[PDB]
């Protein structure tokens, strides 16, 4: 093993680009917060941290299970990789459903995109993160089927590794979003 | 010897160069009649199912034997019809291989030489070669 | 009739269409475009579009016929 | 790959200096304080270059020298099988057409067209990712 | 019990009717297993659905043009003058349990019928299945397409609503009226008078539940009898010749496959009839001749007709005190299409001079001229269909409606030619791809560098290889060639256990060896048969 895996370097480079996309989203969020006039989040929204903490913990532990799946895949254990990646998929889907519940709770009160600037930036940033999470889940399903189609070669493990890279990037961006939206406010 | 800027690479292939603005190919004929001759050779060889070849160069003594010598370089000499013209010695020789035997070429070759020389007498080398290839390809028939 | 150097599997199916049919069809289509100019419409941008498409079709037909005439297409 | 990680480290350093200097220079002397727009972009540009360079440095520390990175080496050092490269595929054009369908749906805001475009995108990405792994049809 | 009973029933059946020879001949009939040979099956199965639901619809529909006041449950139409047919259609939708579901399943099955007939016709045309001795079967199929089109037309016209009434007025009345000498006579024979007659809905009902379905059933029976007794075609392949049929016997593989496809097609139709709204006639309202809506369109299989009416540029003739309207063109247009559809095998026989008996299909790539012709036809059909819909296209995808009409007018001449050129070149290019794979072998995708620095892609010869190494050029035999090494058994055996937990390695070894040996045995059997018949 005396070469770099270029699928991995390509995935790192693209993940950096996606981080820059989220930079654009953060630039949207931070402006219009300096225009809050001492109310941020301005009324009537009420940030329910009580439901937001569990989904963050679920996403972080799902990254832990994804890393466990990578450890399984690197030694040629296709079945352990499938187990840990099904765990990661279920837990990421749990995160998506928790974010949906948070969305419906906020909307029922009156925090919407056409309502306020806070709802605007909040829904934009978190919805694009949720889109990235749905993309990650699609990647997980596709990779699991691909491992089912063929003998588990090193290229299979490379693909699983780069999918885990994508999941780690998503969980980190979510940690930044959480620390900026629910703690710094 | 290798010319200026020519190198024998590690694969045995030769890597040549050209001075900026110069030509890798400098045949003393226009591109249009060269295209005409290329089309004539290609389509006549497809129509006669036999490769055709045109040679311009010195023949020395016994132009027949020289044309025998040079048809060995054709990729498929047995299935080949080579028209060798020495314009300074004013010699024409059609040479045809074993596979092209009794395929209508027996009459075509003298008629090919007649067409070549008839067009030559005006002073058009490529026109005569084109005419000879055309008439020979008409004469020869696919196996 | 066509050979297998231009259409590899010419022995397996109908693989040649006479050039005259496509030439005549192109000219007829250009004529149809020209005919569609006379009508019950008041606009004239569509007239320019019809003239342009008829012009390009006639140019293609004439180019093909000319090149086949000189043997540039065999 | 010491030089690659070195390039990205240099870029990361310059971008960190630019971001911090911009934040300090607009916290004071700017009308609204921290600009909150250029600062975020510069900070995450530092993040981009940092991610790439740090990953490349982890790669290079555990990597023995390749022929490419070693001066005065022979071509025969590079002999052997390179990896796998797709000879051909018609899936990229279908992926692009599906993304275009979804983009047209989102431009004109036709939700059905967006849904159809996303379905086509998923199908064509499935085709691309599965292309060289479909085994023989088992009958 | 059910063994001695089966033996006794077989003995009784054979003593009364002695069908053993004929029944065994039917059980041993071999059918090729290509997926496209299932397309026709779809057109059959949806038809069966159209019968079943159709019969159900006859138990509640009243085909009358007599005026009534609604007086029903659907509030937005109470007190509205309508026809008895529209009233009973609303009653099917709202008053009968499962009536709306049966209506929607029936209309979805009509759409599937039309679409599957079109796809099956495409398969037959492009694969050359119409050639001798299968020309009369093409003629029957074309008549079936025409009959199905007019059957669906007369069907969605049965509930006398505003949209279908507009369709009846525009097409069945205006075009019929405008024809020369016998046009108005045809109109008055058909409608029994002027257009808003009293014997139109009953007449269409009798044409639609009995007459056209009876003709269609007779033609389908003749069609399938011909396919059964002129055995099915097949693609060229390993053991495939002009004199054999290679595939599976009727019992049990083919029967199970056909029954399961029937079940799954019925399931698709049921899901669509449940989860997708088709023809919600309470929103359209009853048909009044004085009112019309913007989106006046027929079902998709008829749209080209209306499209041909939209784009033709208002050319009329007035010879000696008479009028030949624009709609005449439309009728002629339809006829031309229909004629050119029915006579195509004879036209191609007259053009190519090929009157040989054929049983091996052609790949569409190997017949570039016919493939280009069919592409031209499909492109023209699609352009007419979308021209019919240019109003909705211009409302959604913002375009001038005049711009869409002019795009259609220029396109219905330019686009067929472009499509012909592109399709012809594309078919020849596919042939060249096959030739490259035969000359050099499957490109694996692996690239390696030689000690002198030459990059070479590893090639996989598909046959004999010369002394040092290079493929011995094979000969094209009219069959597909592998072009991905994954399709050959390269890297194709993961762990044999469940999706999450594996099985013991001994069972994996046994199953892998069994698969390997069975595949080798099948390949060997095919090769020995092919050598024996050669
Ligand atoms: C917004 C855009 C911005 C950028 C976006 C992206 C842009 C993309 C970049 C574009 C740049 C691309 C440039 C690279 C080109 C590709 C590389 C290449 O190979 O080019 C080499 C290419 C070589 O040229 P060539 O020698 O002509 O090669 C073609 C073959 O040799 C000769 O072909 P052939 O030997 O096979 O001849 C047969 C026929 C090929 O066959 C055809 O295409 C004609 C088919 C006609 C239909 C057939 C009907 C069949 C019978 C069915 C019955 C129904 C009828 O070809 C012709 O004869 C041409 C004339 C025929 C035109 C007919 C059109 C109308 C007919 C309509 C009738 C059918 C309507 C029925 C229904 C309508 C009513 C309902 O060089 C060129 O690019 C040509 C440029 C010259 C143009 C100048 C002349 C025109 C002047 C202005 C216009
Ligand atoms: C949506 C498409 C947009 C693109 C359209 C392209 C527009 C460019 C065309 C503009 C004018 C072209 C100049 C042509 C002059 C020909 C000179 C010449 O070659 O003489 C030697 C040549 C003598 O033969 P030769 O010595 O044996 O040639 C040996 C070589 O092997 C000969 O073989 P060869 O094939 O190598 O050379 C033949 C030569 C001539 O081939 C032809 O024979 C056909 C020429 C017809 C064009 C005439 C203009 C009519 C076009 C109407 C467009 C309406 C707008 O090639 C050409 O076609 C001319 C170059 C144009 C090719 C397009 C290049 C595309 C690449 C760049 C992409 C985009 C470029 C667009 C913008 C360009 C400027 C930035 O003379 C001829 O053959 C021409 C006479 C044959 C009849 C031609 C067909 C008649 C067309 C007139 C009827 C149109 C009705 C009036 C319409 C009014 C509109 C309002
Ligand atoms: C969908 C709903 C509509 C219904 C249609 C469904 C499918 C219709 C026919 C598809 C084939 C079905 C299988 C079949 O008919 O086998 C006949 C088969 C005839 O045996 P074969 O020896 O293989 O064929 C005799 C020919 O000599 C065989 O000699 P060949 O192979 O040399 O062929 C000679 C000739 C012979 O062609 C025929 O045999 C015509 C038969 C027409 C039947 C329909 O074939 C032809 O000429 C080809 C064209 C035939 C044109 C017929 C189309 C006319 C329109 C029919 C209207 C459809 C209604 O008869 C049976 O096996 C039935 C035995 C089963 C009895 C069960 C036990 C009895 C219990 C009774 C107790 C009561 C409870
Ligand atoms: C193959 C062929 C046409 C042979 C005929 C031979 C010939 C030259 C006849 C003369 C042609 C003439 C004179 C006129 C042409 C007009 C004509 C033939 C009318 C009769 C109707 C007819 C037989 C049409 C051809 C059959 C046809 C187009 C079948 C469809 C092609 C196939 C195989 C499609 C399979 C792909 C599939 C199942 C789904 C892909 C999804 C898409 C985008 C399908 C395209 C599509 C279609 C096809 C619609 O019909 C449609 C209707 C309403 C709204 C939208 C759509 C739509 O998007
Ligand atoms: C300013 C200049 C503007 C130019 C305008 C127009 C272009 C003029 C030339 C345009 C040419 C007009 C005359 C013409 O079409 O005749 C010849 C063809 C090819 O024959 P060729 O002798 O082998 O061509 C090679 C020499 N090159 O068609 C035929 O011969 C007839 C073949 C018989 C086909 C039967 C027709 C069926 C109709 C199908 C309808 C769809
Ligand atoms: C594009 C930007 C995408 C942002 C992602 C955000 C998604 C999640 C945002 C959640 C929406 C929300 O909660 O906002 C509440 C409002 C109710 O507001 P209302 O009616 O006035 O009042 C309440 C009365 N009922 O719903 C809405 O606007 C619905 C907006 C939902 C947007 C869906 C995004 C589709 C994805 C587009 C894909 C683009 C792909 C491009 C292809 C190249
Ligand atoms: C209601 C309409 C139709 C029905 C129910 C139908 C059904 C079938 C079926 C089940 C087959 C055998 C299996 C298959 O090849 O897929 C078949 C074959 C065939 N069909 Fe159709 N089809 C219809 C319309 C058409 C049309 C529009 C054409 C043109 C056509 C021409 C043919 C021909 C020539 C064959 C013989 C093909 C062969 O033997 O390989 N049919 N049809
Ligand atoms: C190829 C065969 C058939 C086709 C393509 C066809 C097509 C259609 C269509 C599209 C409708 C409109 C449904 C709606 O809008 O509600 C319809 C209505 C109807 N069909 Fe059929 N049909 C076929 C066969 C039959 C048969 C065999 C029967 C009777 C046994 C039947 C009975 C009816 C009745 C009574 C209606 C009017 C009731 C209603 O519209 O709800 N159809 N037909
Ligand atoms: C212009 C066609 C049309 N526009 C509209 C506008 C709105 C709507 Cl909602 C429907 N549409 C349609 C339509 O539904 N199109 C399908 C269609 C059905 C029947 C017919 C007629 C054509 C024949 C039956 C009539 N003839 S015939 O031979 O001369 C004679 F006299 F009947 F013998 C051919 C034509 C098209
Ligand atoms: C999340 C979006 C939808 C993705 C669904 C992809 C499922 C298609 C893949 C099929 C897997 C079949 C593997 C069996 C191969 C054996 O051999």
Q: What does the alpha-carbon distance between residue E269 and residue E264 come to, in Å, rounded to a whole number?
A: 9
Q: Which of A145, A146, A151 to mutate to test the pocket of ligand 10 (most atoms within 8 A of CB)?
A: A145
Ligand found nearest the CA of E515: 10
Nearest partner of E158 among E195, E104, E204, E119, judged by Cα: E204
Question: Of all protein residues, whose CA lies closest to atom 20 belonging to ligand 5?
Answer: C20
Residues near ligand 6 with C-beta < 6 Å?
A: A 103, 107, 112-114, 123-124, 127-128; D 102-103, 106, 114
Q: How far apart are CA C24 and CA E374, in angstroms?
A: 20
User: Residue E86's closest CA among E283, E285, E290, E296?
Assistant: E285
User: Which chain E residue lies closest to D112 (C-alpha atoms)?
Assistant: E396
Contact B46 C3 (CB under 8 A): yes
- Does residue D67 contact residue D73 with C-beta atoms inside 8 Å? yes
Q: In this structure, which ligand is nearest to the CA of A107? A: 6
Contact E370 C16 (CB under 8 A): no
Residues in chain B whose C lies over 2.5 Å from the next residue's N (breaks after): none
Residue E107 tokens read as 């209309």
Q: Are strands B51-56 and B80-86 parallel, antiparallel or unpaired?
A: parallel
Distances (CA, A) of A141 to A92, A134, D129, E189: 12, 11, 12, 64
User: From the DSSP assignment, how many helices (H) and strands (E) are in chain D?
Assistant: 4, 1
Asked if residue E305 lies in contact with residue E98, where contact means CB atoms within 8 angstroms, the answer is: no
**Range B84-88 contact pairs with CB under 8 angstroms and sequence separation of 24 or more:** B84/B55, B84/B57, B84/B59, B85/B54, B85/B55, B85/B56, B85/B116, B85/B125, B85/B128, B85/B129, B86/B56, B86/B57, B86/B58, B86/B59, B87/B56, B87/B125, B88/B58
Query: Alpha carbon of E460 to those of A151, D4, E437, E469, E490: distances in Å?
Result: 20, 37, 9, 11, 11
What is the distance in A from the centroid of ligand 9 to the CA of E248? 45
Nearest by CB: E410 against C8, C13, C53:
C53
User: Are residues E532 and E238 in contact, defined by beta-carbon separation less than 8 angstroms?
Assistant: no
- Cα E391 → chain centroid: 27
What does the longest C-alpha to C-alpha distance in chain D come to? Answer: 75
Spacing, Cα C61 to ligand 5 middle (Å): 8
Of residues E69, E106, E77, E109, the one with CA closest to residue E94: E77
State the ligand closest to the CA atom of A131: 6
The alpha carbon of E386 and the centre of ligand 4 are apart by a number of angstroms equal to: 11
CB atoms within 10 A of CB E92: 22
Helix (H, G, I), strand (E, B) or coil at E397: coil
User: If you measure from the C-alpha of residue E224 to the centroid of ligand 3, how many angstroms do you get, rounded to a whole number?
Assistant: 10
Residue E518 vs residues D34, E485, E488, E521, E525: alpha-carbon distances, Å: 73, 20, 15, 5, 10
Q: Which residue has the tokens 């624009």?
A: E326
Distance CA D110, CA D116 (A): 10
- Its domain, for residue D106, covers 1-139
Residue D5: name the closest of D71, D60, D47 by CA. Answer: D60
Handedness of CA D8, D13, D14, D20 (dihedral sign): positive
Q: Counting beta carbons within 10 angstroms of the beta carbon of residue E47, is it exposed (0 to 12), middle (13 to 18) or buried (19 or more)?
A: buried
Instruction: List, as own/partner pairs, every contact residues A66-75 make where C-beta atoms lie below 8 angstroms and the sequence separation is at least 24, other chains included.
Output: A66/A164, A66/A167, A66/A168, A67/A164, A67/A168, A69/A160, A69/A164, A70/A160, A70/A161, A70/A164, A73/A152, A73/A156, A73/A157, A73/A160, A73/A161, A74/A157, A74/A161
Cα E184 from Cα A44, distance rounded (Å): 72
Contact status, residue E58 vs residue E281, Cβ threshold 8 Å: no
Which residue blocks in E246-389 are alpha helix, DSSP H?
255-275, 281-284, 300-311, 327-342, 344-352, 368-388
Contact residues on chain B for C71, CB-CB shorter than 8 A? 36, 39
Indicate the number of domains in chain D: 1
- Residue E204's alpha-carbon distances to B104, E199, E201, in angstroms, are 74, 9, 5
Rounded to the nearest angstrom, the gap between the alpha carbon of residue D117 and the centroid of all alpha carbons in its chain is 23
CA of residue E516 relative to chain centroid, distance: 38
Token digits for B91? 């010699």
Is there a contact between B103 and B141 (Cβ–Cβ < 8 Å)?
A: yes
Distance from CA of E501 to the nearest CA of A (A): 6
Report how this structure was experimentally obtained. Answer: cryo-EM
Q: Residue A142 is part of a domain; what is its CATH number?
A: 1.20.120.80
Closest CA to E173 of E157, E155, E187: E187
Q: How far is CA E503 from the centre of its chain?
A: 45
Contact C71 B46 (CB under 8 A): no
Q: How far is CA E358 from the centre of its chain?
A: 23
Q: How far apart are the first and last CA of chain D?
A: 48
- Whole-number Å distance between alpha carbons of E352 and E374: 16
- As a whole number of angstroms, the distance between CA A63 and CA A57 comes to 10
Distances A102 to A122, A173, E57 between C-alpha atoms, Å: 12, 18, 48
Q: Are B85 and B116 in contact (CB under 8 A)?
A: yes
Give backbone dihedrals phi and psi of E446, rounded to 5 degrees, phi first: -80, 130
Whether D31 and A6 have beta carbons less than 8 Å apart is answered as no
Instruction: Measure E450 CA to nearest chain C CA, in Å.
Output: 34
For tokens 């060269």, the residue is B34
Q: Cβ C8–E368 below 8 Å, yes or no?
A: no
| Minimum-distance ligand 10 atom for the alpha carbon of A142 | 6
**Rounded CA separation A81/A103 (Å):** 33
**Does residue A1 sit within a domain?**
no
Q: Which chains touch C (3 or more CB pairs under 8 A)?
A: B, E
Task: Please report the DSSP string for D99-135 in residue order.
Answer: HHHHHHHHHTT-HHHHHHHHHHHHHHHHHHHHTTT--
- Residue with structure tokens 């080798």? E520
Determine the Cα–Cα distance for residues E457 and E330; give it in Å rounded to an integer. 58
Token readout for E38 is 């299932």
The torsion defined by the Cα of E454, E457, E458 and E459, in degrees rounded to 10, comes to -120
Show the domain range for A24.
6-182
Query: Torsions phi, psi of E67, nearest 5?
Result: -80, 140
Task: Kindly state the tokens that stand for A167.
Answer: 């999941």
Ligand 8 center to E106 CA (angstroms): 6
With contact defined as beta carbons under 8 Å apart, do E88 and E116 qualify?
no
Q: Is D64 on the interface with A (CB under 8 A)?
A: yes
Distance CA E92, CA E102 (A): 9
Considering only CA atoms, which of E486, E488, E483, E464 is closest in space to residue E475? Answer: E464
Distances (CA, A) of E236 to D103, E34, E233, E242: 43, 11, 10, 9
Residues of E in contact with A147 (CB under 8 A): 494
Identify the residue among E449, E452, E455, E456 best suited for mutation to test binding to B, counting B beta carbons within 10 A and taking the highest. E452
- The protein residue with its alpha carbon nearest to ligand 6, atom 33, reads A127
Residues facing residue B14 across a β-bridge: B8
Number of domains in chain A: 1
- List the beta bridge partners of residue E248: E31
> In a 10 Å sphere around its CB, with 0-12 CB exposed, 13-18 middle and 19+ buried, how is residue B3 labelled?
exposed
CA distance C13 to E427: 12
Residue B96 to residue E455: CA distance in whole angstroms: 40
Beta-carbon separation of B46 and C74 below 8 A: no
Residue A106 CA to residue E89 CA, distance in Å, equals 45
CA-to-CA separations, E105 to E49, E160, E265, E285, in angstroms, rounded = 8, 19, 12, 21
Within 8 A by CB and 6+ apart from E34, the residues are E234, E235
D38-61 and A6-30 helices cross at what angle (nearest 10)? 160
Q: Could you write out the DSSP letters of every residue in A110-122?
A: T--TTT-HHHHHH
Chain D contacts to E (CB-CB under 8 A) = 75-76, 78-88, 104, 108, 110, 131-136, 139
Q: Is the dihedral of CA E215, E217, E220, E221 positive or negative?
A: negative
Interface of C with E in 13-72 (CB under 8 A): 13-17, 25-26, 29, 32-33, 36, 39-40, 43, 46, 49-50, 53, 57
How crowded is residue E20: how many other Cβ atoms within 10 Å of its Cβ?
11
B129 vs E90: CA distance, rounded Å: 87
Question: Among residues D132, A32, D118, B8, which one has the least CA distance to residue E444?
Answer: D132
Smallest Cα–Cα separation from A119: which of A102, A107, A105?
Answer: A107
Q: CA E347, E352, E358, E362: dihedral to nearest 10 degrees?
A: -100
3-class DSSP string for C6-17: CCCCCCCCCCCC
Atom of ligand 8 nearest to the CA of E92: 41
Chains contacting A (3 or more CB pairs within 8 Å)? D, E
DSSP B120: H
Element (H, E) at E105: helix E99-127
**E348: closest chain C residue by CA:** C14
Give the three-class secondary structure for E362.
Answer: coil
Q: Do E500 and A149 touch (CB under 8 A)?
A: no
Residue of D nearest to E35 (CA): D139
Separation between Cα atoms, residue E84 and residue E90, nearest integer Å? 10
Interface test mutation site (partner E, options C2, C10, C15, C35, max chain E beta carbons within 10 A): C15
CA of E501 to the centre of ligand 6 (A): 41
3-state helix, strand, coil in chain D (%, to 5): 65, 5, 30
**Cβ pair E141, E223 in contact under 8 A:** yes
What does R_g of chain A's alpha carbons equal in angstroms? 18
Pocket test of ligand 3: the residue of E15, E26, E225, E254 to mutate, having most ligand atoms within 8 Å of its CB, is E225
Q: Which residues of A122-157 are buried (b: 16+ CB within 10 A; e: fewer)?
A: bbebbebbbebbeebbbbbebbbebbeebebeebbb
Alpha-carbon distance of D104 to D110, in angstroms, equals 8
Residue nearest to atom 3 of ligand 5 (CA): C62
Q: Whose CA is nearest to atom 16 of ligand 9?
A: E302
């Amino acid at each position: 093993l005396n070469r770099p895996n270029m699928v991995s370097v390509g995935t790192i480079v693209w993940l950096s680009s996606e981080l820059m996309f989220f930079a654009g989203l953060f630039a949207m969020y931070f402006t219009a917060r300096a225009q809050a006039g001492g109310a941020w989040p301005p009324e009537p929204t009420e940030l329910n941290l009580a439901l937001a903490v569990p989904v963050t913990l679920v996403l972080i532990a799902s990254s832990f299970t994804c890393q466990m799946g990578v450890f399984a895949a690197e030694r040629g254990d296709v079945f352990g990789l499938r187990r840990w990646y099904v765990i990661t998929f279920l837990m990421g889907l749990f995160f998506v459903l928790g974010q949906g519940y948070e969305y419906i709770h906020l909307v029922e009160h009156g925090t919407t995109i056409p309502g306020s600037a806070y709802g605007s930036v909040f829904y934009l940033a978190t919805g694009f993160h949720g889109l990235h999470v749905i993309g990650g889940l699609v990647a997980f399903v596709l990779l699991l089927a691909r491992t089912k189609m063929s003998k588990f070669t090193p290229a299979q493990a490379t693909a699983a590794i780069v999918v885990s890279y994508y999941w780690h990037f998503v969980d980190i961006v979510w940690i930044a979003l959480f620390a900026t939206i629910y703690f710094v406010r | 010897d290798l010319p200026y800027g020519s190198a024998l690479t590690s694969s045995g292939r030769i890597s040549a160069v050209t001075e900026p603005g110069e030509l890798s190919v400098h045949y003393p004929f226009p591109t249009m009649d060269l295209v005409v001759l290329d089309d004539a050779l290609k389509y006549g060889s497809r129509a006669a199912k036999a490769r055709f070849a045109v040679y311009i160069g010195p023949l020395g003594a016994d132009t027949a034997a020289t044309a025998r010598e040079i048809l060995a370089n054709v990729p498929t000499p047995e299935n080949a019809v080579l028209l060798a013209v020495s314009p300074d010695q004013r010699a024409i020789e059609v040479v045809y291989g074993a596979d092209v035997k009794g395929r209508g070429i027996e009459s075509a070759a003298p008629l090919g030489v007649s067409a070549a020389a008839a067009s030559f007498k005006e002073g058009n080398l490529i026109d005569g070669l084109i005419s000879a290839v055309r008439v020979m390809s008409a004469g020869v028939s696919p196996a | 009739g066509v050979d297998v150097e231009d259409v590899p599997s010419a022995e397996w199916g109908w693989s040649h269409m006479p050039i005259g049919v496509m030439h005549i069809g192109g000219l007829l289509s250009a004529a149809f475009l020209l005919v569609m100019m006379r009508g019950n419409h008041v606009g004239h941008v569509e007239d320019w579009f019809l003239i342009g498409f008829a012009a390009v079709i006639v140019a293609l037909v004439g180019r093909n016929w000319w090149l086949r005439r000189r043997g540039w297409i065999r | 790959m010491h030089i690659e990680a070195r390039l990205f480290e240099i870029l990361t350093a310059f971008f960190a200096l630019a971001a911090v200097v911009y934040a300090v220079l607009t916290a004071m002397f700017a009308t609204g304080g921290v600009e909150w727009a250029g600062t975020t972009a510069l900070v995450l540009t530092t993040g981009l270059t940092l991610i790439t360079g740090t990953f490349f440095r982890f790669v290079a520390r555990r990597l023995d020298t390749r022929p490419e990175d070693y001066e005065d080496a022979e071509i025969s050092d590079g002999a052997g099988e390179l990896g796998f490269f797709a000879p051909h595929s018609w899936w990229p054009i279908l992926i692009s057409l599906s993304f275009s369908t979804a983009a047209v749906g989102a431009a004109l805001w036709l939700p059905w067209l967006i849904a159809a475009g996303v379905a086509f995108v998923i199908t064509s990405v499935c085709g691309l990712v599965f292309e060289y792994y479909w085994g023989p049809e088992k009958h | 019990d059910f063994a001695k009973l089966a033996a006794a029933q077989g003995d009784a059946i054979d003593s009364r009717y002695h069908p053993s020879a004929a029944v065994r001949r039917q059980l041993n009939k071999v059918f090729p297993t290509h997926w496209s040979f299932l397309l026709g099956e779809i057109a059959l199965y949806s038809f069966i659905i159209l019968l079943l639901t159709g019969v159900w619809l006859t138990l509640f529909f009243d085909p009358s043009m007599a005026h009534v006041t609604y007086d029903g449950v659907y509030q937005p139409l109470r007190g509205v003058q309508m026809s008895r047919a529209y009233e009973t259609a609303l009653d099917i939708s709202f008053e009968v349990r499962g009536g709306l579901f049966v209506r929607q399943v029936h209309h979805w099955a009509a759409l599937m019928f039309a679409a599957s007939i079109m796809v099956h016709l495409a398969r037959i045309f492009f694969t050359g299945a119409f050639r001798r001795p299968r020309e009369a079967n093409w003629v029957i199929g074309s008549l079936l397409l025409i009959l199905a089109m007019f059957e669906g037309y007369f069907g969605y016209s049965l509930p006398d609503d505003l949209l279908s009434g507009t369709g009846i007025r525009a097409a069945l009345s205006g075009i019929t009226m405008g024809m020369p000498v016998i046009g108005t006579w045809l109109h008055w024979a058909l409608f029994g008078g002027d257009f808003p007659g009293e014997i139109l809905i009953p007449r269409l009902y009798a044409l639609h539940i009995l007459l056209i379905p009876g003709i269609i059933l007779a033609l389908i029976g003749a069609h399938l009898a011909l396919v059964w007794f002129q055995k099915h075609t097949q693609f060229p392949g390993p053991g495939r010749t002009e004199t054999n049929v290679v595939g599976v016997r009727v019992m049990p593989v083919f029967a199970v496959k056909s029954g399961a496809f029937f079940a799954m097609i019925t399931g698709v139709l049921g899901l669509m009839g449940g989860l997708l709204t088709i023809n919600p006639i309470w929103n359209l309202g009853p048909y009044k001749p004085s009112q019309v809506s913007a989106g006046s369109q027929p079902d998709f299989y008829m749209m080209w007709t209306e499209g041909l009416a939209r784009l033709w540029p208002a050319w009329e003739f007035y010879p000696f005190g008479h009028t030949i309207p624009q709609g005449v063109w439309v009728a002629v247009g339809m006829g031309l299409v229909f004629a050119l559809l029915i006579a195509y095998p004879f036209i191609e026989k007259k053009v190519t001079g090929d009157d040989a008996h054929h049983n091996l299909l052609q790949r569409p790539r190997d017949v570039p001229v016919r493939t280009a012709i069919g592409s031209m036809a499909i492109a023209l059909y699609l352009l007419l269909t979308f021209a019919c819909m240019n109003d909705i296209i211009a409302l959604k995808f913002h375009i001038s409606l005049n711009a869409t009409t002019w795009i259609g007018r220029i396109g219905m001449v330019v686009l067929p030619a472009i499509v012909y050129f592109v399709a012809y070149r594309w078919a020849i290019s596919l042939q060249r791809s096959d030739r490259e794979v035969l000359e050099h072998g499957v490109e694996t995708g692996i690239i390696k560098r030689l000690p002198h620095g030459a990059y070479v892609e590893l090639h996989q010869p598909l046959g004999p290889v010369d002394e040092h190494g290079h493929p011995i050029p094979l000969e094209y035999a009219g069959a597909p060639l592998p072009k991905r090494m994954n399709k050959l058994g390269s890297g194709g055996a993961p762990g044999t256990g469940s999706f999450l937990f594996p099985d013991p390695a001994v069972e994996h070894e046994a199953l892998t060896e069994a698969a390997h040996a069975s595949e080798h045995k099948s390949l060997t059997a095919l090769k020995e048969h092919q050598d024996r018949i050669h």
